[model samples]
Target chain A: KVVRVGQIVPSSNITMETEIPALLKARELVAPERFTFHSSRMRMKHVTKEELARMDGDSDRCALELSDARVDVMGYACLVAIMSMGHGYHRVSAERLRNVTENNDAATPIITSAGALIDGIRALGAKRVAVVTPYMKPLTELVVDYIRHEGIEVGDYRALEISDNLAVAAHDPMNLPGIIASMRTDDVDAIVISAAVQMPSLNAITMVEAQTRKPVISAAVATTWAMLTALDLPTRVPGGGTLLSGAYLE
Target chain B: KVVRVGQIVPSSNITMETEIPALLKARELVAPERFTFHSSRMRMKHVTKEELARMDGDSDRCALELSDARVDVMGYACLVAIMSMGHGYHRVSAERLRNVTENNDAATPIITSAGALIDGIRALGAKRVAVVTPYMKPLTELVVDYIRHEGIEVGDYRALEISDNLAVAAHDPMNLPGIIASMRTDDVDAIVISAAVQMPSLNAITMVEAQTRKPVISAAVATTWAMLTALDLPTRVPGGGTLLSGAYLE
Candidate 1:
């Protein structure tokens, strides 16, 4: 039988879609026959609860478009954007979305990057972390608060405040080594690169971990790790870093 | 300080999450810190639109809980369940749920598996494809039609008519080599393994491709690849196969 996975992302955000494929290619895995990208239009850079809720109608439109793809599952590739909104929202969102697709006669699975990231961190036993983000100060602060609520301590942080996500996407992974070098402190246990999924961080994962002598996790790597875990596969890939080393696969 | 991806998945379907991690591990990449599975509260074996919609509500609620964890992205890990409904459903669902999380002062990124699959196929330059599915005949047909609507051709296809997604997940990947041994005809350029994201097909990707001597794809690999590309990283890995060989990264 044929199996397909669908990805729903922000229209303005381009990094996740690009990075996901790059990671797959690096792994020597074949591509799928049916792959689709569904985008929900977003204008704001700082995602807030009100702003996130306001976009529901637009996201629903995107979901409908994705549903048309007949994918076996759906992935929502956003992290803090969803968490900044509420508790248990991902489950409710997946159910409502599954209903929409099935109504059109396609029953599928669903996933979100935020949920994946949390799972990734916990899997790593990272109770405290140091973070570097591409979002503005306010948004980054909100993200920190959200994680703190999750029972993790924020040891240190930085926000680039880059308004354009694409610009953040353009930010070099090669540069992450320097960035992480600047962010590392004695109290940090792990490093969080690109506090949001819209930014690419895979290239920096291994380098950051090695340079900092601590585990490094990025939204992209974490999302992939979580996605693989949900599928019951091992989570390891060469050249990515220690986190991709299969230690988390049970 | 610590950044990682988090996933919101169904407790009933462990294949997607499982396969994804295993594939990564095979490639020697590190796995996520944890993979949090969410129960759908959905009990139906054959899912319908209304039921799918209700599931969306459930997903949103689940996301809300995950949001409290403050992950970088939240993945809505269902495929056909969303595609079966209609167009633009994932977008709307993500936005609405983002709103819900925002109302609670949390923001996170959202991704759906269906959207990722569609995008992955497009990345591969296939507007038309033949498919195989592990779903009942009725659901399988709906999936094909949905692909047609997405501007792709279903040159040929087959449905295993497996109602139990978990059973579909349990099928041995080693046997897949023979499953697609003769499936690839001239009309069919690429083969789809599980059509459902809930199935574990990462290990089978190479077998399917080698057996078919043509391109073979799965929902799991596609989603991961798309995420890598989204971040603009190289798309090649040691153990995966041709698809992950970096040819697609360009």
Candidate 2:
């Protein structure tokens, strides 16, 4: 039997589609022939609050559509979308999404990228965290506030201030090391690359973690780990961040 | 110290820019400070023999430019462009490119995606292999013949007939399993997803391998493995492929 994973992502986003599948493929090395991913899209592009609010309105529709696939788990693949909705929005959003699958006669687990980022940080036993985001300065503030409300101190952060979704996906991996290095990571126990799913940074997670000598997690990696854990699957995926490797594994 | 890797790719290609760096990030699990990638592009688009010939002609110029970065290794990142040039073209090309680097007083190791695919296949000890490509019919035939010339028998193969470089990169990973399943693989020991660097298949490699119950490899994964191997680095990289994992490590 195949484990089907459903994802709801922004229509213009490309990173989650690729990173999540790539993560599952890596998971197959630890547990082979067990996972497959199916995704549905929500329409939104820029990271403005208005656009985010509009996109969050599409969640029920996206969730209901994915429910038809009888997916074992559903992932709300956008981070800021949920975080922008409210302080504890992922909890509300997941319950509402799970209710949709329940109506379809299947009660599936729901994981949100926002919740996963928080969970992944907590899993690392980190209370002080640094962050890097691809959001505009205003949205980046919202992100910092959201994480702080979750009780993790934001020691330092970088706002790339890039609004174009595709351009965010095209952000150079080489530049990440420098951006991360510039952050004040002195006392932070972990670093969170907490931006949109549209931004590509999974490739930089391991590198950044190595350079900082701290657990580094990204929205994409956290989402993948959360899904696997919810499914009662092995969390040790190769090449994923430390959250999926030694010391972080349950 | 940062280990710098140089690559020569088609000017319009997109996959290597993403896949190569991502693969190195995966490798960072083994050696964190081991590498950084720098690329130079050769201008070509269509995957025809004429364009392939012209693209091959631009290799030395691309190689010389990458040499300016003082790269420790150089990879000719297009598979079909080199294979379509002739049966043993990669050997000649690697030597010529290395000579270019040598002239700059930097004697660097050179690898090609075509050579990497063959090396990866042989590393798996798979003599009988099935293949998949995103090239048109003629180029696919050239790839098959090229592998056959390397002493690996091509039991069966499929070509998607895609010529647009960007479109090839956009080939859906979801379609790969079904395509591999459609091939006649009764006697094959392995399957090679031999699309050029422009095609993104690294995300599908492990999944295809699981379904086929045989080792599966791709041009991008193989190319990454080959580059790391040439640098005398540990070949074990998380999430890459079985080639980079245990038993296949030499």
Candidate 3:
């Protein structure tokens, strides 16, 4: 069976298109369902607060646009864009996007990678987690605050201070091993190797998990898991690391 | 250099995702430019009159969604959907889509496979052409008339009459050699092996051209050529046949 996946991404984004599909195609090897990804982009060329604020408003049009396609599930991809707004803004953003689709008569389920990250950590019972992000320090702190606002402990976090969106995507994911090893993994329940969806970690996720013997998840990985949950499909993606083992499907 | 290719497709259609990217990656071997493809789809499930009319209306939203991405060039990937509307509708559709980008203050050139097919034939200075389509007989005739209205002669035509979009995509492109030999190609200037965008033919074009000594072009190849033109890039794509010989970049 074939399913349509609608993605709302930053205009400058290149990785969500790359990483989101990689995990889904990986699922095809062990799963029966097939997926096609469709994206509507917001004109966000950089990863600054002012630009993120303006681009956040563009998601309404993006959501309204994709509703015409009747996607089974939808995902809003920038974690900092969501966290930048307010405490618990992810639910508010998801509700607004869902309402936009409902008005178009294509009421689809919506999830933000912001909210999805929280859901993924909870699914793995990871209360205190270490975080890593390609965002500037200010945005990374906001992300940590957002996670703590959801009642999770941010035992340790580090920022790579990557400002441009493309640079965040281009930042080598395999380099994540060094970043994860430097964080306080012993004090945390899990590791978020890539806190931003634009930052890549899927390739490095499996290796980092095996070396550290800890559960690792990223916004992109959690976004995929969240979509699988919304679609009522099994959340198993072989080689997608501990969070995607389908053992945490609940 | 990195270039983004934005495609507006129908939800049920799958081959453009396979064919166009494969065509470009084939270009990558001998070309310096690297290409990445992105898509926004409309809710078109079957090929029919009523289903198609609504699909045309949805293109505006798709256009608005992608213009923000500021893709170097965008493509609208359904041939019959535009062909069935009226004569010269591709020009109108392309213009309307470009304007949709203006709302975001980012305007980019867009080409439709329907328009691209006509341009591809003209690129080879072909006055008369034989066409093959995966549409029903009624719609195939509509395509024949659409090309005729543009001052080209449709000397002969055939319809595979495949209704399902996925089935049309799944139709073996290699099976095209047998079909080409069965046609009366002696009088036509070019052989259009796949007139519908969803129909697969890029892989067969070279061999058929070699065997028949006639220029072969499909909507996919033509669409690729049109996008290359809009980007102000060379039109050469290895194994892409006579039209893609880089002989008609002007």
lDDT of 2 by residue, A95-152 (tens): 9999988998888899999999989888877899988889998888888899999999
* Per-prediction tally of clashes: 261, 0, 0
Model 3, A1-250: lDDT tens digits are 9999999999999899988887787677546899999999999888999999999999899999889999989999999999999998999999999999999999999999999999999988888999998888888899999999999999879899989888887889768888888777987888999889888787666556645657778999999999999888987664465667655565
Report the lDDT tens digits of candidate 1 across residue range B1-250: 2234455565566765675555444444432333323222333343444544565557767777777776555566667776766766656666776776677677766666776666666766766676777777877777777777778778767777666656776767666656665464467645666677776666666434433434556766665565456545555544344445444663
Query: lDDT score, residue A50, model 2?
Result: 90
Q: Which candidate leads in TM-score?
A: 2
Report the lDDT tens digits of candidate 2 across residue range B117-186. 8998888788998888889998899889999999989888898999887788788976887888888776
Best by DockQ: 2
Candidate 1: regions farther than 4 A off: A1-3, A29-53, B1-250
Clashing pairs in 3: none
Candidate 2 ranges with C-alpha deviation above 4 Å: A1-250
Candidate 2 has a TM-score of 0.55
Model 1 chain B: lowest-lDDT 10 consecutive positions? B31-40
Q: Per-residue error at A160 for model 2, in Å?
A: 51
Ranking by lDDT: 3, 2, 1
For every prediction, compared with the true complex, DockQ reads 0.03, 0.09, 0.01
